[PDB]
């Protein structure tokens, strides 16, 4: 019912798996799910970004 400026305290492993997923992620665009914990209203954290199978269909 109220809006505040949020923040994402990242685990670096998030961007590490994103860079592996993009480097090895051959330029066909791909999809996955992000895994953290909603700490509060003005911040969020991502502790994990897990991997997907080779969904080369769309």
């Amino acid at each position: 019912a109220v809006d505040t400026a949020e923040q994402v305290y990242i685990s670096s492993l998030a961007l590490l798996k994103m860079l592996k997923h993009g480097r090895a992620g051959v330029p066909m665009e791909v999809m996955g799910l992000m895994l953290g914990e909603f700490v509060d209203d003005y911040t969020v954290r991502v502790i994990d970004v897990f991997a997907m199978p080779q969904s080369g269909t769309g």
Binding site: P53, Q54, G56, T57, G58
Partner: protein
């Protein structure tokens, strides 16, 4: 009377490795033929020349 025991343990292993033959066929074919239908059903798949 134990050659039949080794051969029947090998027949249980034959059923196991035949479930694995059907696994390497069908379970891998899930991935393979699913995404190969899906790559065949991408487009009228861009005809071309060798």
């Amino acid at each position: 009377r134990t050659r039949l025991l080794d051969s029947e343990i090998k027949i249980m292993k034959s059923e196991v490795l035949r479930v694995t033959h059907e696994l390497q066929a069908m379970k891998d074919k899930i991935k393979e033929n699913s995404e190969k239908i899906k790559v065949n059903k991408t487009l009228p798949y861009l005809v071309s020349n060798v």
